A and B are shown apart, each in its own frame.
Chain A
Amino acid sequence: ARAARTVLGQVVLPGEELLLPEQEDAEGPGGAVERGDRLLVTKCGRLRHKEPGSGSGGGVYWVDSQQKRYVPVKGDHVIGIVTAKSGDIFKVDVGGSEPASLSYLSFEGATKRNRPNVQVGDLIYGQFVVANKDMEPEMVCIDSCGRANGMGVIGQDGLLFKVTLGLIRKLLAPDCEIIQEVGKLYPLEIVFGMNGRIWVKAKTIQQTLILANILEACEHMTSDQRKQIFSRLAES
């Protein structure tokens, strides 16, 4: 094999060598970096690439693939199930190759806090700051950027259902209205986990159920379709 960036800006196989006349970059997911430089394909995916230019403190060469297990990244948005609370940190699940960990403090409280507000089998909305190849990942719930609070332990009642990443992505694409498109219907509360997790909760079971089911199919539809399909729901 022999390739470089554009040589294949498409789909590749696990076990390939390719590179560009470079110096430094951040190895993505299904690619390996060793050779001046070079790269290897490990998993099986198409080629993806986001450019940093220079100012943009973010630039990598990516290889994605619609595979089962979810892979946490930077401060990613995921939904959780709490596997267990052992000491100051508890592991919640995210469907990674293992769990992650949350502090006895990520809810803006000093001890004697979030006690009954943290429980096995529970749900959580969290962005984990730490997920790096050789280390295990851990997540938070505060808004450290300003220590505000954008992520709480999920709702009073509700629903969570898996979702094809392909969809989660497309469902979360800023240039996709579904999100605002959904901004419609009232009164509703839903959460969107990278890890493919939608926690919903509408008036009754029903509108709620529909909505989810509607979601389960969301993907293949007139870029418009959902629209009424939604304003259909919206209306009742």
Chain B
Amino acid sequence: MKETPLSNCERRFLLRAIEEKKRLDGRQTYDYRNIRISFGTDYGCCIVELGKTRVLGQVSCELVSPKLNRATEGILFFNLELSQMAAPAFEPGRQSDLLVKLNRLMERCLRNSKCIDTESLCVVAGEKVWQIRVDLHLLNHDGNIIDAASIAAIVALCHFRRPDVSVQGDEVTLYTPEERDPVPLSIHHMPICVSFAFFQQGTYLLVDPNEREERVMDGLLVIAMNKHREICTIQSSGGIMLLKDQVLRCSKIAGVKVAEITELILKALENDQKVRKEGGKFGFAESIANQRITAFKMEKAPXXXXXXXXXXXXXXXXXXXXXXXXXXXXXXXXXXXXXX
């Protein structure tokens, strides 16, 4: 669609300022923009905000017939989608280079960590196993994705709720009324993404680049570290001179961050759990719903409701009544003689 243009000075100076080890959005070299997380009305729903980049996480529940081979550990699927409204240039279909690399790239560390059990879901191995699909929707697109992208999922993955009531012998039955209790998951390990942007021979290194940054950076690296201070995946891109040595701090540094980042999931993951059990308040996001301006919520009454409902005859009778007699004519027009 519309190509988001890009000045010269803008870029150049944007860098000029990196040479300054000064962040334009005025932060420090290894910090994250604040990231927020809102939970959905229903369970298995979430929204992430890496501060301007927004992701959508939804997980699914199914009783599919596992695959051939190891018909003993059910399968799972995830998908990441890039929206139109995502970026301007995001007309559905073309950006593959991202949706390719990224979708797969992301999806890599998922089966990499196997942080997700595949037999606990499996009810009747060989016959009926569970299929859990997870979908990612890039709402807005500003700077570092894959990270909110990961958070999105992980953050999401922990909130979903699988149903189950009673299945004995070779029969399966589940009732939402009994489902009012059993509905959890197998989140063994939780891995996250940490990208590192490079600048001019990686003689400068940034973390969680914003959109503008995103552009200026020559080469970028990602990392995957599960709570257990260990990796799952790394990826080098944008072609650079990545000295095994330096490759080493980032790796480190990434761990450093994954640390705190987790905190939140759990942190809020808890805060959420709390509300359902107390006062109560599911929804999408009342926070943006109360903060002054650009948003409003109120509830209004429905005897204006039934008062006019009788008027229907007035318009229904006045008009159609005289309109029904033309039928006597249509009876004979094309039907009678068409016998040919």
Contact = CB atoms under 8 A, between A and B. Distances in A.
Interface of A: 81, 83, 93, 119, 121-123, 154-155, 157-160, 199, 205-206, 209, 213
B177 interface: no
Contact of A158 (B5, B13, B20, B22): B13
Interface of B: 5-13, 16-17, 20, 22, 26
A121 B13 contact: no
A154 B22 contact: no
A157 B16 contact: yes
B16 A154 contact: no
B8 to A, nearest CB: 4
Contacts of A209: 17, 22, 26
A81 B20 contact: no
B17 A122 contact: no
Given A157-B13, A157-B16, A205-B17, A121 B22 contact: no
Contacts, number: 39
27 contacts: A93-B5, A119-B8, A121-B6, A121-B7, A121-B8, A121-B11, A123-B7, A123-B9, A154-B9, A155-B9, A157-B12, A157-B13, A157-B16, A158-B9, A158-B13, A159-B9, A159-B10, A160-B9, A199-B9, A205-B16, A205-B17, A205-B20, A205-B22, A206-B22, A209-B17, A209-B22, A209-B26
A122 B9 CA distance: 8
A217 to B, nearest CB: 12
A121 B22 CA distance: 24
Contacts of B11: 121
Main secondary structure of the interface of B (DSSP, over half): helix
Given A83-B5, A205-B16, A160 B22 contact: no
Contacts of B10: 159-160
Contacts of A159: 9-10, 13
Most buried by B among A121, A122, A154, A199: A121
B197 to A, nearest CB: 19
Nearest first, the 4 closest Cβ-Cβ pairs linking A and B are: A121-B8, A81-B5, A93-B5, A205-B20
Given A157-B16, A159-B13, A209-B17, A123 B8 contact: yes
B26 A157 contact: no
A63 B66 CA distance: 62
B51 to A, nearest CB: 16
B7 A160 contact: yes
A158 B8 CA distance: 10
Contacts of A206: 22
A157 B5 contact: no
A121 B10 CA distance: 9
Nearest to A213: B26
A160 B24 CA distance: 12
A16 B20 CA distance: 54
Contacts of B6: 81, 121
